[PDB]
Design a protein around this ligand. Structure first.
Ligand code: HEM
Ligand code: HEM
Ligand code: HEM
Ligand code: HEM
Ligand code: HEM
Lengths: 304, 306, 305, 305, 306, 305
């Protein structure tokens, strides 16, 4: 069955839109959902062959119950707030996600305009971020960001619902968190101290050797094997964003996985820690201000 | 598994459409050329890797097939039927071989067409040659985005490629071509709003009109045909603009691929003969078909093994 | 006499930064003004030949008096509020303008970061806009925007200060205004009605002929002839911006001219009208929320601080 | 004086349009001429920065007298037919030339459409050619074509009218000829024989040494010295064109020069020959089927009308 | 199960070919390196998404295999067999590991090469290093378009990847490398017409000569090999030009992939030792092989499994 | 007087070829010098409009006297070896320099092939380096390299001979040195230590503040003011090159300037040091293995041979 564009690569531009559905807005939303692929093609065909416009649409747990009766995806539940001793992953409201990507911001903006035009009066905007590529795929911490994403068949196996939930095969689960960074504190570290926080070399993006990589480095904590042997993988399409006057330097985190348990395990390790690490050191420079979980159905579910 | 020709490939910036008829006695030369056409395509195309995107799709008409081949025939292959509506007509014009040549640059198309025609000189008579070009943001000469609702991915394969219904010809497709000339002086006299009602989509933004406002005789309404499965019937269109300003020739070269000609024919009947709701497609009040031919585009391995 | 990059073309990305200088922040600002070209090269050189990074720095009238002790450019004054019967061009605070352009937003953002890093604690931000190209050089009203900009020698003559003010030759004057548009109202007009508001055809960008072009159309009102029969020109580097959730669909207006008088005459025609036209119809769909005037000195002036 | 874009480089796409002016068409024509710069910008601005759209407009000898009162350019006369013993340079009708270039055919086509739409009923089309780049700047004979064109200051001196005709300074003269090639005959020659016809190496574009270069080679006959021993140069913007079904493999020749005497001297040498050479060997594989001469005035001459 | 290395990927504009021998006791460092090469590839390559197109194919020679690995060997893996023709020699030269690095830009290739060699310093001795570059429209140093008849799509997978005939190593391939230097002075003394007869294709247009004019000793005639069933045997070549004008080194770096070495060997035998009608490939009258090595390039998961 | 392409920007590919002239090869070399513009055009034209091919030809002091009679450029002498306490700038043979640049190596190689083909039997190659762009204009030390190059009028003033030596106006002097780097040692330093060696931030390429910039830092030692207070500048077109197997990680240094004394003053400061610096710390990780000085004449000098 045909997935949405959850497997597609990073692009140079993105718009992330999160909205809540107003009381009585359900019908309007359902009608838009049935049209969203049409709208994407309407805008996107204009910029063949380099436009690379896509839109992934996600639905929250509470929204699901308001919109649909009957079958629910097995892993769909509200984002779980994690209150660590020091750092907190907050749960914030969000019923629908539109993850819009293209090679140019205009395409993303034109599609978002059409979507929101159809939803005006039925939804309330919760968050809107316009993301942009930063040099050679860097984030606002200055590190190459996305390197260890799965590709090809390994990506398919890590991201797409299959025979464990066959009515929903071809779907995925998206976790979003908007992070703001303390760039003044971060820039007070040496490069070598930043490398130890992340677990990779800053300029060249080469992973630190195991004898050197700290236990509380980001890469250490988000490296998880299940009882099975295999690495647990997620597909991240994080984008930088910001505003210089407000001193806002951000990473918009979005991670896709076949079940949310994988992403949640990673978050637990980061925010609550392990026996050998109290928390991910990246959170000493990164504050999460949103957190929401969505199911992104197979394309044909929406088309109904 | 048979390897299709490049019938699922996207629109390109440049195209040449060449239609020829096979002269009496020319059959041998044509067979030879058909066996070499992939080699010719590589010879030219490899030069411009990786952004050339050269391809050539070769099609064979019904009458031609019967002249060329003792053996099995594609199940749906017949001559294009003239459609003589009360007002508008879809003419049937001669064509035995189609070459649909696309690239990101005209020079590649022209070089390959030169090589093909050089082989065929003295065995065929040219009927039509069109040099197509992309016009702004995938627009046609009417100013509308053209190709939006083409199928992609798996749906395209299912809509376009012959499968187990005709196993000897699996991986083939059917192409219909019509050269249309537009009355641009009449068209440009309409408001944008009236043009949108002819087509059924918004002109600048390419968004479909809502069902409550889209006329029954708009192009999109009449070419939207629901199959038994509840789903719309789909074709893949590779239409290209063409023209000549001095002669006031402003054209759309229509080419549509489908797994069976019955889909394209049903759309044509609705456009030219109308429905209970609609006398004919309003696009035809601004568009004249001057050619019409139907071709089978076999699997690439079919051509190779002549 | 080397100008700043005021004659450079439109790019696909821009950042517009307007700040005010805090009391006691004058010395820090002067140091930064002297280094801005070095900072531009530091970021820009990374992305040649296609980055096309540039930064034009402007200084307002009030700030000029706080920073510098010598002569003032002859045309430098605070932006003049225009209070029309129906529409108003507001004057808002702004001491320094940074007009940053590149083919990619990251270069603009990196440069803006370096500038603001130097200025933190000395300036208060007043406006920041991240502009982006919209299809085929369109604005948020869906019209091609920039067509009649002067080029070549005509641009230099229209834009650069010359012998009229010789101490400031190679400078220019920038007027900025942030406009928000009422897209719901605009989309209620037919295309033909919109054409009559602007004065050009929407899809093809061809000018309406003089017989059909309304006198209160934008193009008619911003077409001004000099006493010498000669068209008065400005150079506009307008960019779209916006936010869909807030229903913010914007034009960031920036115009460069050799004297502000040209830009002001255009604004007066638009907001106050003429004998033939009460006001520019574009303003029935556009609200100005900022308005500031800056002088952009020659590059050597800033270097020699 | 601002010239038209006569010094501008070769582009990947071009449209050449030649028309004649019907009875009573003059007013319509003059009105279009005053507007062509405006139309070019209207279309061209949409494809900043890479569109590279330009339009050069030329006016023939007879048409000049119909359109304009008073002074004529000194060198403007009808194309002179050259009836050689073997080959002939034909003269054909042509009142106006539009040489339209861009990086993409769509821009050229859009502009041509707007020009012709304004001229409907006033003109009769004579020729229309859609030219395209062929590999690495080759012509239909398979040679790199344009190499020795002048550049920079040498180009301005070879092409622009100056103080020798001061009322028309910044103009130029264009000669056009459409050539169709006998490719079957050409392809019957070895590469080494082709190189002796042209005077350059086929693959590498290197000029043959003087030891080896034949005197009836194309490059020998079109290399001409002025009485002061200096090289007479023209600027050629020729483009390939063709139709495979009609066996039509063409060179559209267009050459600009500050006086037509230079281009005429080259044509005389090619068609009529010299002491050492009966005619240019390229003409044994190339037939001229059009020939016309135009004056391309300074851009401001057209604007002023 | 089976995930190939990037042995099917297209030509790129830049390449680095690195051939090294393993020093005594360097086996552990090499094993470690091999398990990390994919990681290094991603570390460098992700920086230049989407256009960088960085890949690295790692090969292991016959003698190396037995020093590194316990257990089964690939069925086809043996040392390159020297071929001593009367006139021309295909030399066998040392080489334990091959790194075939490709990208759209040399910087990416160089950066990855730097990381690989930094890990291996002390454990290996360099034998050969060539930096290849695209030359015009996919030309080689003889001025001919080079690569044209490479198989594509399913035909390439069938020709290149090991399958059911050696299931433990399914998804692997065999690479043969030969560094050629050309005698350009002698070559450029030939007419174009003579050059075309050596190669068997037209020079400027890359169109194949018809078989009825193609010399039996032309390079294309001799490297056209029909198997038992009359099917063409195919290899995948990623040859690149290289050179130094000052020392008059004008080179072709030959690299050919095949699912068994026998195909590539047959072609080399035909070249260097000739047939009934042709003593040897005329291309060799203008080209000298100065290296020759054979490598197995395992499935990606094999290398990672260390 | 028209210069060679000495003011043109950095490109992503380059070939540097240094040859000596064999006894008896003088006539062959003179013929080639007169044809090099021709050759460049022959190859370059094929890759209009983006090839960006150029070749600058330089001639050393000893060669000059073998090739030419009469007046010589005022500053043309053999490269002066610098024997420092610790590091040495070696002088190596070189009679001609071809500095070839383009956006693609094939164009460089094709032109080099043509040149060398004309010179076979007359010259012996001394050095050939194929340079390549490294990420965002980085060198092998990982720093952005070229940032503070002069542009515009300042570049012209810094690089072209003028009235100080009027017979040779429009020429320049090129110094070349091939450096190999000890990357293993370099990588043992912290980023912060590397930054102190260079005088700029590694990732962002911003210059270190005056206060923290060491006296023996590269940028400090190559910042030079003349007696009149003016900054002495050179134009650098250095390119990375290397061979991983041989652990050769190189910077090919090439610097143009209107007099050798400017570049020589910088080299003296680097290798022999100053009051507050024994030598440039960059030399602790860089070894010069060639050193040659060439005069690059105006283009019209070459053509006139
Ligand atoms: C707070 C902002 C975040 C930043 C700036 C960030 C940055 C990075 C960087 C630079 C890397 C190394 C390069 C790479 O493989 O991509 C990395 C790896 C990773 N990050 Fe994050 N990350 C953040 C949040 C998250 C979150 C919230 C998760 C999971 C819930 C996550 C999961 C991962 C994973 C799985 C990897 C790959 C680790 C490996 O297998 O080597 N990150 N991240
Ligand atoms: C006469 C010249 C024609 C022009 C200028 C033209 C133009 C268009 C345009 C502008 C659209 C809407 C955007 C899109 O989906 O492509 C469209 C849709 C379509 N056209 Fe045409 N068309 C022409 C002829 C035909 C013909 C002859 C057929 C079939 C035999 C056809 C089949 C379709 C179909 C299937 C669609 C999609 C309808 C839907 O599902 O929304 N068209 N065409
Ligand atoms: C809401 C803000 C604005 C929008 C959306 C807008 C849009 C446009 C458009 C679409 C055009 C026609 C194409 C062109 O030549 O660029 C135009 C022309 C022009 N606009 Fe505006 N404009 C705005 C504000 C201004 C302001 C504030 C000024 C001057 C103070 C101005 C001065 C001009 C000028 C001089 C022209 C060229 C007129 C001519 O000579 O034909 N615009 N504008
Ligand atoms: C000596 C340096 C070599 C050069 C310069 C060279 C050049 C060429 C050229 C120009 C072609 C024609 C176009 C094409 O790629 O299809 C060709 C074809 C070919 N070459 Fe070579 N080649 C060389 C060595 C080899 C070697 C050593 C082999 C095999 C061991 C080989 C195998 C082939 C094959 C299989 C073809 C395709 C023939 C066909 O099926 O049409 N080449 N080569
Ligand atoms: C040894 C290898 C060399 C390396 C790797 C190197 C690298 C660099 C770097 C990274 C910079 C700072 C960025 C820039 O402005 O370009 C720089 C600046 C400079 N280098 Fe070097 N350089 C080398 C040798 C030389 C030599 C031999 C000279 C002169 C003889 C020289 C003259 C300069 C000058 C004039 C500057 C600009 C200083 C300023 O005004 O800010 N360099 N170099």
């Amino acid at each position: 069955p045909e997935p949405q564009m959850v497997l597609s690569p990073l692009t140079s531009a993105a718009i992330f839109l999160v909205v809540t559905i107003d009381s009585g807005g359900e019908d309007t939303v359902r009608d838009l959902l049935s049209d969203v692929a049409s709208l994407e093609r309407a805008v996107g065909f204009r910029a063949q062959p380099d436009g690379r416009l896509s839109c992934v649409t996600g639905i929250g747990s509470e929204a699901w119950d308001r919109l649909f009766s009957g079958a629910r995806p097995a892993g769909l539940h509200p984002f779980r707030e994690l209150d660590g001793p020091v750092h907190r992953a907050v749960a914030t409201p969000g019923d629908l996600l539109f993850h819009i990507r293209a090679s140019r911001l205009d395409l993303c903006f034109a599609l978002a305009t059409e979507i929101m035009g159809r939803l005006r009066g039925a939804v309330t905007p919760q968050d809107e971020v316009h993301g942009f590529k930063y040099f050679d795929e860097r984030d606002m911490l200055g590190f190459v960001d996305g390197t260890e994403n799965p590709t090809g068949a390994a990506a398919r196996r890590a991201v797409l619902v299959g025979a464990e939930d066959p009515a929903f095969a071809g779907g995925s689960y998206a976790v979003v968190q908007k992070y703001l960074h303390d760039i003044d504190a971060w820039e007070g570290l040496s490069v070598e101290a930043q490398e130890r926080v992340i677990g990779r070399r800053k300029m060249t993006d080469v992973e630190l050797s195991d004898d050197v990589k700290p236990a509380d480095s980001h890469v250490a904590l988000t490296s998880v094997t299940g009882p099975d042997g295999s690495d647990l993988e997620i597909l991240r399409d994080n984008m930088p964003f910001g505003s210089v006057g407000r001193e806002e330097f951000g990473t918009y985190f979005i991670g896709y996985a076949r079940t949310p348990e994988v992403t949640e395990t990673m978050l637990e390790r980061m925010f609550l820690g392990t026996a050998s690490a109290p928390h991910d050191r990246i959170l000493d420079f990164s504050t999460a201000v949103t957190g929401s979980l969505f199911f992104t159905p197979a394309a044909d579910f929406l088309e109904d």
